[PDB]
């Protein structure tokens, strides 16, 4: 039978995960939650997806608009095997006891503390670590991107320094600045480094910044090599690493805008680029240091990771069988 | 099957090319490119033959080992009509070539009315293009203004609209302004006369450019000659094709959420072919009607392009073509 | 000299504080701050006694070793009037506090009209505030509308203006939208009625927010009731105080260049106190006048607050105060 | 008094002209323009003689009623030195004209290293320009890197910095990207070798362009050769000229507030000639120092051009010039 899934928090990550779940033949979307009957709630219903009020506390918002719901999250928790928690950072921790009391497994997003789960997850890097687990944290958008390429060359990395040039807000978020400024994270290192280390063992330090863009994040990566490695070896490795794609600035891929245009060209749902983008020409080796630039489509790179986490937690399949299945259902040729 | 070709596989061209492949009374023969960039490779991957725009550009493709199906001259030999989606002003420069070839041609809104025998917006003056050889589909903004204004023209004594336009399309990263409002000092703006090439209406417009890439926005004022109520306008717009009412009260706070609606639909390139009208903005004060609409400039003109082909070849009547095109693109009403 | 205090050392607050400092008939007793940030340190550095906005804010200061000259309650005891520059809606909550202290108070444009006895724009209705206790200087945009509209009021039968607004001030990095246009679905916009609290005219306005920080832009259309020519309007604007004409032909393509003119003048905080009007935008078509103007929202209500003070304490005639304020701020004409 | 002419009254050009009129050992002979736009008028209003950058441009001022004092050649004959502030690449082109006229010449950062005899940053290699006829003050980004790195040069055996640049200056409204991050796929980028043109140090850089106009920001990592504490670095910066420390805790959340500091100063054009360093960003982890700084690209190289003039004309000793220049601009 199919694993019964519920999604708490039908937000930017949540609705995309819900969609992914509907594309799996071994999983069934029991329902999702919303805190208000806005256009997204109407869309879920329009899609035939049962809409549950996130809590009894939000029920009046629905009743007010005369928007019928299938119940509250408490009702949904009684009919699922696992809940994908896609609520605001920090809110996952608050929901955990509700999940434990209901006896259902739970997946939390990167916005939560490592604290929250038994293990942090990135399919291609530590799938087996989540086997049978009940609580798994799919790391954040930037952490996932960093892990995908760093993990592929971990054996050659002695130390890595990465600068996160982050977008200020997702395309659908119009209530957040900065309109015109660069906001640095003065804490050195940013949360990214240690977060990476909750998935793969590696010496890493990171620094982050926020700039006025909504498209994708960009990573400036520097690795001190403790073992021989050439430029071609690196493109070869990246060329063969799943959920990673090389883009040539020479073909016209000048910025994150053209990278996203590639996804729009594929006619992807929400222009989702599940794959981490690496500028081919940026991969260089000077002395014993490797350098390269990558981009992350933060609205969707963790989508495939949530699906695979589900397979590992229920021991539905081995690592590569799940990744390939997840990949095919989302159009990731990898 | 009407054989179609697209000269200029850019923002409009690639979306019109796609629309053609969804019409079973048509056949996409090929598209042109001036260089083998990632968009040329995409066309090829889609199985669409790509021709070098001109004999001049051939070496660019040869250099990269990118095999082409030929050049625009070769293409012109294989089509009944060419859809020209080259930069504004370049379409006129191509007209002679199309003339000699003996093929019908459709130009986009960036060309002067000069370039064609008539300007077009299906739901407004479809019949005016029946059998023509050269037709120009009006700009993204003119199309948006026409669609809603045409629906209430019988009540319109005078119209004044302000165009708050995006500064550059999302895939255009070489255009400012990054932080400023650029006014068009030519007043009245050229949008009004452009609307008058499609429908008879007293109109005046003014335009501005702001740092956004998503959608243009229009502020419309209409002096009424006949009484009309808020509900009347809502009912008319709800029964007007290729127009959609969005409620700020349901979360549509800005053009970003409007586009989010198209992304939720999983629309190709997040295309919102339809003009978006904020339901709450529709107000009547005295003898004046006010409303706000938004236009997704990357795609509102593509269904107009497909209907123009049907009219020019007299393949179908106005509403039959419109209905068929809408279905092919997922436009409900 | 009139004893002046300013509650709210923010965007408007610190600029009005500086303006007060330039008057030979006024004295700045102090400014209020809710926390010891770099702006509080600046005020202290300038020698401006800094008062904690409230009792419940003194801890933040003590925690940082920042000595304050007391609280708002203390400051009110030492002034004849306080310029309230707190966020919209807070002014109303502060009025009772001011009345109790028995001091006169000036409110900004973010407050409702009823918060004061009269609304105000020096060059329009200076006299209306003579000897008053509570006056509301209308918003940055309302002020821009009044200056230009007041000068042609006698020919205006009806006016429709569209406000294309900056999303956030340069110093405000916590507010969106990054990429979108957000319309105000309420028709009319709050601007029309606020203008009517200063000058009697028929007007309806609509507003939008776009991603820029520099200045707001107004699209103005005026239905005429008396003969008027373009030339007449230019001349009228060339002769109305606090309004300057800019030529696109000289390089003023957008609001960035308008602001660049203020930077070139070395204006404090790049303040452009005067309303900017694109000369080339002025045009009359039939019975309607059109023009485009820009407002530097950070400083255009500054000179108005000063004049408000003189009218309220009846310190001088309308034009003596205006000329006196203008000279102190470098205001051109 | 040395006679200075500025060729290219642009963003850097008009600000340097101002700086010179603020000096007591020099006089602005005139500036040049290609068209009589509003900036050309402003220069005239300031009483600055305006020369048409070239004869072929005279008609432009003739079509208008704009009287000019002549061409670039007429200016070259009345100066001891000319500050070239033309677009990058044009400086090299204009060099043969400066030579045939026998006048010293300073080029800006956009030009290639070979356009001058030595690249310059006053507080780092002032002496290197003493007496020379051709010197290029390095770019905004390199000046910022040099000022801070130079101060800890003796403790760094390796530096890696990432350049997060503003896409267009406040007054440049015809340049993107409006919404995107544009990378420099050439890595390391030209910034490192540019720095190496002023001070001797092992550095590698990478750059990016983002949708902002206010300031560039540098993410800096330094491999230490000698022990160094956070308090050590902070003290060094507090004692390094043309460098200022800012506290996020005091409200400096981003480049916008940093700029706001300059506006509060009522600084001309809101010029922040000094490099900004976020005090809280200074941290040492292992044998590595990390810190973040921001550069106001419109004004950062201004004081540098004034000092280069003194070095080239040997008018003063390193620190005497810098103190004087700093004084004239209100640096502190
Ligand atoms: N690009 C991204 O925004 C991104 C990328 C990677 C990971 N994530 C992670 O996903 C999680 C959420 O991100 P998001 O961007 O989807 O947030 P979001 O703001 O888009 O939506 C989160 C959802 O939480 C819902 N919500 C609020 N309170 C709730 C409650 N009490 N119960 C249930 N739902 C509630 C809201 O309705 C909203 O739909 C975070 O941990 C975040 O770090 C986000
Ligand atoms: N939002 C929009 O971009 C929009 C909306 C409605 C109408 N239009 C109109 O559509 C037309 C094109 O707009 P666009 O957005 O596609 O421009 P675009 O620049 O995005 O794409 C145009 C294409 O024309 C091709 N081209 C350039 N020179 C060519 C040549 N000599 N021969 C053949 N092809 C050549 C280019 O290679 C490019 O692929 C214009 O008239 C424009 O006003 C544009
Ligand atoms: N563009 C503009 O910012 C602009 C233009 C014209 C008019 N105004 C008007 O100015 C008035 C204030 O605007 P602003 O731009 O100065 O806002 P601001 O946020 O820049 O400054 C407000 C000041 O009030 C302070 N504050 C918060 N609570 C306070 C309290 N209880 N007491 C005292 N201060 C408190 C803030 O710390 C700050 O010092 C508003 O009514 C607004 O409509 C603003
Ligand atoms: N932030 C900056 O703008 C910045 C920062 C650091 C270094 N620089 C360097 O300074 C130089 C110019 O920078 P800018 O920003 O001032 O450019 P700018 O565009 O603002 O203008 C440069 C000027 O050159 C004049 N010019 C053009 N052609 C000319 C000609 N043929 N003869 C004379 N003058 C001509 C232009 O009109 C203009 O006034 C470049 O090398 C640039 O890299 C600029």
């Amino acid at each position: 039978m199919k694993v019964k899934v519920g999604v708490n928090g039908y937000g930017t990550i949540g609705k995309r995960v819900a969609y992914a779940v509907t594309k799996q033949d071994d999983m069934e979307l029991i329902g999702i939650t919303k805190t208000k009957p806005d256009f997204e709630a109407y869309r879920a219903k329009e899609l035939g997806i049962p809409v549950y009020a996130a809590s009894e506390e939000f029920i009046p918002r629905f009743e007010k608009e005369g928007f019928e719901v299938a119940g509250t999250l408490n009702d949904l928790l009684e009919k699922v095997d696992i809940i994908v928690d896609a609520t605001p950072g920090g809110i996952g921790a608050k929901n955990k006891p509700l999940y434990e009391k209901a006896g259902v497994k739970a997946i939390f997003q990167g916005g939560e503390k490592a604290d929250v789960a038994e293990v942090s997850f990135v399919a291609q890097a530590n799938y087996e670590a989540a086997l049978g687990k009940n609580y798994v944290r799919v790391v954040s958008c930037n952490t996932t991107g960093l892990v995908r390429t760093l993990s592929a060359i971990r054996e050659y990395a002695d130390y890595v320094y990465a600068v996160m040039i982050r977008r200020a807000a997702d395309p659908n978020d119009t209530k957040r600045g900065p309109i015109n400024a660069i906001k640095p994270t003065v804490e050195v290192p940013s949360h990214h480094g240690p977060d990476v280390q909750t998935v793969i063992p590696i010496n890493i330090e990171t620094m982050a910044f926020v700039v006025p863009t909504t498209l994708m994040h960009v990573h400036s990566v520097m690795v001190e090599l403790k073992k021989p490695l050439t430029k071609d070896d690196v493109i070869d490795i990246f060329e063969n690493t799943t959920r990673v794609l090389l883009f040539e600035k020479e073909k016209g891929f000048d910025s994150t805008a053209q990278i996203i245009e590639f996804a729009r060209d594929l006619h992807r749902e929400w222009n989702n680029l599940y794959e981490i983008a690496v500028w081919k020409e940026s991969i260089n080796i000077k002395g014993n240091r490797l350098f390269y630039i990558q981009a992350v489509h933060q609205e969707s790179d963790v989508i495939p990771e949530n699906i695979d986490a589900i397979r590992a937690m229920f021991e539905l399949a081995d690592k590569w069988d799940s990744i390939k299945k997840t990949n095919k259902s989302l159009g990731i040729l990898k």
Side-chain angles (χ1 to χ4, degrees), chain A residues 96 106-108 112-121 133-138 313:
Chain A
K96 189 184 175 74
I107 288 165
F108 301 89
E112 301 289 326
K113 287 177 170 51
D115 239 345
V116 82
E118 304 177 82
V119 64
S120 294
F121 176 112
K133 300 301 178 183
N134 295 307
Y135 298 108
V136 175
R137 178 183 74 153
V138 162
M313 291 161 85

Short mmCIF file of all heavy atoms in Angstrom, two decimals, chain A residues 96 106-108 112-121 133-138 313:
data_model
loop_
_atom_site.label_atom_id
_atom_site.label_comp_id
_atom_site.label_asym_id
_atom_site.label_seq_id
_atom_site.Cartn_x
_atom_site.Cartn_y
_atom_site.Cartn_z
N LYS A 96 6.15 19.46 16.87
CA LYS A 96 6.68 18.12 17.16
C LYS A 96 5.94 17.33 18.23
O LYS A 96 5.61 16.16 18.02
CB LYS A 96 8.16 18.20 17.53
CG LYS A 96 8.84 16.83 17.64
CD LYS A 96 10.28 16.99 18.11
CE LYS A 96 11.00 15.67 18.36
NZ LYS A 96 11.37 14.95 17.13
N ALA A 106 7.47 12.33 11.29
CA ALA A 106 7.43 13.71 10.83
C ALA A 106 8.71 14.17 10.18
O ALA A 106 9.81 13.80 10.60
CB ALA A 106 7.08 14.63 11.99
N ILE A 107 8.55 14.97 9.13
CA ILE A 107 9.70 15.55 8.43
C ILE A 107 9.64 17.06 8.63
O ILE A 107 8.60 17.69 8.41
CB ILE A 107 9.67 15.22 6.92
CG1 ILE A 107 10.00 13.75 6.71
CG2 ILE A 107 10.66 16.12 6.17
CD1 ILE A 107 9.64 13.22 5.31
N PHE A 108 10.75 17.64 9.07
CA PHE A 108 10.84 19.07 9.31
C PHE A 108 11.75 19.67 8.25
O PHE A 108 12.62 18.97 7.72
CB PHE A 108 11.44 19.33 10.69
CG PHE A 108 10.64 18.74 11.82
CD1 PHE A 108 10.89 17.45 12.27
CD2 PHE A 108 9.60 19.46 12.40
CE1 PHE A 108 10.11 16.87 13.27
CE2 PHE A 108 8.80 18.89 13.41
CZ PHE A 108 9.06 17.60 13.84
N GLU A 112 14.32 24.65 10.82
CA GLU A 112 14.33 24.19 12.21
C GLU A 112 15.74 23.85 12.67
O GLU A 112 16.64 23.64 11.85
CB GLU A 112 13.45 22.96 12.38
CG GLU A 112 12.00 23.18 11.98
CD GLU A 112 11.26 24.07 12.95
OE1 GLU A 112 11.53 24.02 14.17
OE2 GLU A 112 10.37 24.80 12.48
N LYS A 113 15.92 23.78 13.98
CA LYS A 113 17.22 23.44 14.56
C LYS A 113 17.48 21.95 14.36
O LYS A 113 16.53 21.16 14.33
CB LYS A 113 17.21 23.76 16.07
CG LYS A 113 17.26 25.25 16.39
CD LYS A 113 17.17 25.50 17.89
CE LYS A 113 17.47 26.97 18.18
NZ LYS A 113 16.65 27.91 17.34
N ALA A 114 18.75 21.57 14.23
CA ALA A 114 19.12 20.15 14.05
C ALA A 114 18.45 19.39 15.20
O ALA A 114 18.05 18.24 15.06
CB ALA A 114 20.65 19.98 14.11
N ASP A 115 18.35 20.08 16.32
CA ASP A 115 17.72 19.64 17.55
C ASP A 115 16.48 18.79 17.30
O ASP A 115 16.30 17.71 17.85
CB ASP A 115 17.25 20.89 18.31
CG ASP A 115 17.85 21.00 19.67
OD1 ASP A 115 18.40 19.99 20.13
OD2 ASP A 115 17.77 22.10 20.27
N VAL A 116 15.61 19.37 16.48
CA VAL A 116 14.31 18.85 16.11
C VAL A 116 14.16 17.42 15.65
O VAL A 116 13.12 16.81 15.87
CB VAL A 116 13.68 19.75 15.03
CG1 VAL A 116 14.23 19.37 13.66
CG2 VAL A 116 12.18 19.65 15.07
N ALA A 117 15.16 16.87 14.98
CA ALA A 117 15.01 15.52 14.49
C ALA A 117 16.14 14.60 14.90
O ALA A 117 17.15 15.03 15.47
CB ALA A 117 14.89 15.54 12.97
N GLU A 118 15.95 13.33 14.59
CA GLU A 118 16.92 12.31 14.90
C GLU A 118 18.11 12.43 13.97
O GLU A 118 19.21 12.04 14.33
CB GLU A 118 16.28 10.94 14.74
CG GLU A 118 15.04 10.75 15.58
CD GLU A 118 14.38 9.40 15.34
OE1 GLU A 118 14.84 8.41 15.93
OE2 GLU A 118 13.42 9.34 14.54
N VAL A 119 17.89 12.99 12.78
CA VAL A 119 18.97 13.15 11.82
C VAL A 119 18.60 14.14 10.72
O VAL A 119 17.42 14.26 10.37
CB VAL A 119 19.27 11.79 11.16
CG1 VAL A 119 18.05 11.31 10.36
CG2 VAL A 119 20.49 11.91 10.25
N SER A 120 19.59 14.86 10.18
CA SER A 120 19.37 15.81 9.08
C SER A 120 19.61 15.03 7.80
O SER A 120 20.43 14.11 7.77
CB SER A 120 20.33 17.00 9.20
OG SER A 120 20.02 17.76 10.35
N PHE A 121 18.94 15.41 6.72
CA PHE A 121 18.96 14.60 5.51
C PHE A 121 19.16 15.28 4.15
O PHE A 121 18.66 16.37 3.90
CB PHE A 121 17.64 13.81 5.56
CG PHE A 121 17.34 12.93 4.37
CD1 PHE A 121 17.33 11.55 4.53
CD2 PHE A 121 16.91 13.46 3.15
CE1 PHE A 121 16.89 10.71 3.50
CE2 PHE A 121 16.47 12.63 2.11
CZ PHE A 121 16.46 11.25 2.29
N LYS A 133 13.98 5.83 10.64
CA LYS A 133 13.78 6.94 11.57
C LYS A 133 12.35 7.46 11.57
O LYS A 133 11.61 7.28 10.60
CB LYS A 133 14.74 8.08 11.22
CG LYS A 133 16.22 7.68 11.28
CD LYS A 133 16.60 7.17 12.67
CE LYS A 133 18.06 6.73 12.69
NZ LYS A 133 18.44 6.17 14.01
N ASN A 134 11.98 8.12 12.66
CA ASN A 134 10.64 8.69 12.78
C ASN A 134 10.67 10.20 12.61
O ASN A 134 9.68 10.80 12.18
CB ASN A 134 10.01 8.34 14.14
CG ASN A 134 9.78 6.87 14.30
OD1 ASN A 134 9.15 6.22 13.46
ND2 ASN A 134 10.29 6.31 15.39
N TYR A 135 11.80 10.82 12.94
CA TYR A 135 11.92 12.26 12.80
C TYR A 135 13.17 12.64 12.04
O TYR A 135 14.31 12.40 12.48
CB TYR A 135 11.86 12.93 14.19
CG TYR A 135 10.53 12.66 14.86
CD1 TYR A 135 10.44 11.78 15.94
CD2 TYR A 135 9.36 13.19 14.33
CE1 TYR A 135 9.21 11.42 16.46
CE2 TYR A 135 8.11 12.84 14.85
CZ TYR A 135 8.04 11.94 15.92
OH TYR A 135 6.81 11.54 16.41
N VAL A 136 12.95 13.23 10.87
CA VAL A 136 14.03 13.65 9.98
C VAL A 136 13.93 15.11 9.58
O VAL A 136 12.85 15.60 9.28
CB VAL A 136 14.03 12.80 8.69
CG1 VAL A 136 15.10 13.32 7.71
CG2 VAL A 136 14.31 11.33 9.03
N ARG A 137 15.06 15.80 9.56
CA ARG A 137 15.10 17.19 9.15
C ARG A 137 15.74 17.30 7.78
O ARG A 137 16.90 16.96 7.62
CB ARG A 137 15.93 18.04 10.11
CG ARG A 137 16.00 19.51 9.66
CD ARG A 137 16.87 20.40 10.55
NE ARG A 137 18.30 20.14 10.36
CZ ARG A 137 19.27 21.04 10.55
NH1 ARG A 137 18.99 22.27 10.95
NH2 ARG A 137 20.53 20.69 10.35
N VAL A 138 14.99 17.75 6.78
CA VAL A 138 15.55 17.96 5.45
C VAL A 138 16.20 19.32 5.59
O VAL A 138 15.51 20.29 5.87
CB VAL A 138 14.45 18.05 4.38
CG1 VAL A 138 15.00 18.70 3.11
CG2 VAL A 138 13.92 16.66 4.08
N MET A 313 12.59 6.63 5.68
CA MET A 313 11.93 6.48 6.97
C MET A 313 10.98 5.28 7.02
O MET A 313 10.76 4.71 8.09
CB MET A 313 11.17 7.78 7.34
CG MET A 313 12.09 8.95 7.66
SD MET A 313 11.25 10.52 7.54
CE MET A 313 10.51 10.65 9.17
#
